[PDB]
Structures are given as C-alpha cells and as structure tokens.
Nucleic acid binder design. Structure first.
Ligand code: NA
Length: 91
DNA sequence: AATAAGCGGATGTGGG
DNA sequence: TCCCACATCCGCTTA
C-alpha cells in the first residue's frame, strides 16, 4: 500500500485536490493544507488505505507527526504547513 | 465560552 | 518474534 507521504506528494503533483492542499514553496518542499477542505483529503486517504474507520485530518496529522524523527515530513511553524525531505522530493 | 490547531503517549492493526 | 507503517484513542496545551 502507498505510504502517506507519497499519497500527499502524488496529490500535489496531480493537482486533483487543489482546494485541499497546495505547495507553498515547491522547491523547498513546503506545502499547506486548507483549513476548510482538509477533511475531504483525509477522507480520501482512509478510503485509499481501506481502513476500518473514517479517516480524519486529526488522525492523518497524528500519522504525519510520526515522520518527524526519520524526516520524510516535518512540521513547519506555520498554520497547517509541512515540509518534505529532499530525499522524498528526489524520488 | 466556541472553535481550531498543535502535541504526543499509549495501545491496536497490517503485512511482513 | 518482533518490526513496519500507520490507526485509533485519549487528554492536555496554545491561540
Ligand atoms: Na484543526
């Protein structure tokens, strides 16, 4: 199954949910979720994974926090903003 | 208060 | 066995 950081990177490349997520500085890998439309994107993640329960932005962000150590995605000190690692962007 | 984002420990589930 | 890569639950903190 596709990994969460890859799901998000794929969405940013396709632009299929442009109203839910967007690049801030794509060269730096920084991206931001929509305050009002992030739940629709979270729902899509859960359906793609076939999880038992409805996915929520809160649970999706809890999963993102677990990348902080290994570095695939880091939280930026801006609202709803995150940053992919160079390695993630390179692949 | 109402609303929202942030934080993260503890535990449960998948598929190796 | 026991790690992977989250999912889920819960409560606290900050704005
Ligand atoms: Na929020």
């Amino acid at each position: 199954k596709i990994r969460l950081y890859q799901f998000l990177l794929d969405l940013l490349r396709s632009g299929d949910m442009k109203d839910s997520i967007w690049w801030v500085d794509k060269d730096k890998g920084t991206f931001q979720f929509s305050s009002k439309h992030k739940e629709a994107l979270a729902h899509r993640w859960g359906i793609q994974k076939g999880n038992r329960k409805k996915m929520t932005y809160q649970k999706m962000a809890r999963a993102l926090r677990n990348y902080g150590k290994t570095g695939e995605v880091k939280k930026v000190k801006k609202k709803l903003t995150y940053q992919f690692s160079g390695e993630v962007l390179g692949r």
